[PDB]
Amino acid sequence: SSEELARESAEAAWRLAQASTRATLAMIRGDLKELAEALIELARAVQELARVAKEYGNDELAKTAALLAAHVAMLAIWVLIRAIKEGDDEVRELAKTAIKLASTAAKIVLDALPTAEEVRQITLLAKLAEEAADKKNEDSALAVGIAAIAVIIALWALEAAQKAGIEEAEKGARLLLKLAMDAARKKNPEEALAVLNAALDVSIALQLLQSAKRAGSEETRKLAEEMLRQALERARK
Amino acid sequence: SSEELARESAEAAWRLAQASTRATLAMIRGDLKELAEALIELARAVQELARVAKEYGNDELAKTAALLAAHVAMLAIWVLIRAIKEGDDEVRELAKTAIKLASTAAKIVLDALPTAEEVRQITLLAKLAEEAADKKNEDSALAVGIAAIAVIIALWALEAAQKAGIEEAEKGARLLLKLAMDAARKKNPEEALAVLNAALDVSIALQLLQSAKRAGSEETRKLAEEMLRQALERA
């Protein structure tokens, strides 16, 4: 029922914003207990958004829920590393719960969109962050935390590459997602950080490409495509 | 000269990425000193990008530069909050200089795009955060920090509403910007968070509407209608 799809998705999208606002406020103040406990509430809302997208087969709604799961998993690692670095077992377990809640949400999207490689990479990153949480590791969780940020930036470069349809842009977003997940499985903070600056490099090129596509001045497009390829080679080698 | 426009735009975008990486790296380690002084170098990069768009009249490059200036000003409020909350005068002044550098960047975009309402809102937000800096008041700075990120969400909701061309989405992004800036001058974090939540409500339906290019996900249009109604009652 399309009426029921609009009902459940709208009410889950409202609970999504409610939890996002609660987490943003705690992100300012540094209240890690409230922030992690808010990422739990946020991970639930992403989970039921992935569940409604599976029930009604809305593939676009599943992709949105997968993107949100990646953001919750990434934030929960920054809370995880800052908790084990402060010896807070209560906040560490709160963050761990937020990780696995977002992991199950990604696995729900992976059940609806198994042939979506970016959803697989999101699911692998969350399950990889699960391991870093049960590990009580300040170094492995730090590495997957860097790689998580590189994935998030590459995911926005991908969705921005969907617009305008620049294939050199989405090809680059794919390369960064693979090299970030490769650096995450390697658990090397140096490699993941190298993928991070490359993801930033091409995403700024993208914004420069989109400001060069709009209202002419397409000379800013040439060197931003060249900047895109320079940065992709900065990640390859 | 279009050759020099591509030249200086690439040079400034390169130093923008180098400073963006330096800030992200310091944001991981929690080095608020290095993070603040990396937002300084990032604010100068946005200021050079705004200057370039001004001289060459690239309105699109000026709009993106204003967007960046708003981000740097918002990140510097984050740092200012955690600085005055920890009694760090060194980091508080480092954040203050980053706010003023981003404020100047917004002023330069305003010179090139004075008829852009969103550029005026950003310039007022940076000047208003500049006062919360000299005041070193953690409550006023927290309100303008929430209101800042509420402005950011309303700006992407604006940019997405231009693509979709939905006038109800454009009018909605405008009223959220006005209510956020009002909440920022009022310096009350409560209704500032409310405008933030409403901005998220509408923007979720816009991101799903922009991803709904492929199939008939017309239920997303019902997501936007009801989210825009919820945001109208938020006024």
Residue numbers in the entry:
A (entry chain C): 0 to 236
B (entry chain A): 0 to 234
Provide the publication's sentences verbatim.
We did not succeed in solving the holo-state structure of SP3; however, we were able to solve a 3.05 Å-resolution apo-state structure of the closely related design SP3x, which shares 94% sequence identity with SP3. The SP3x homodimeric design model agrees with the X-ray crystal structure to 1.61 Å Cα r.m.s.d. In the SP3 dimer, the calculated spectrum based on the design model agreed with the experimentally measured signs of the CD Cotton effects, suggesting that the P700-like ZnPPaM dimer in SP3 assembles as designed.
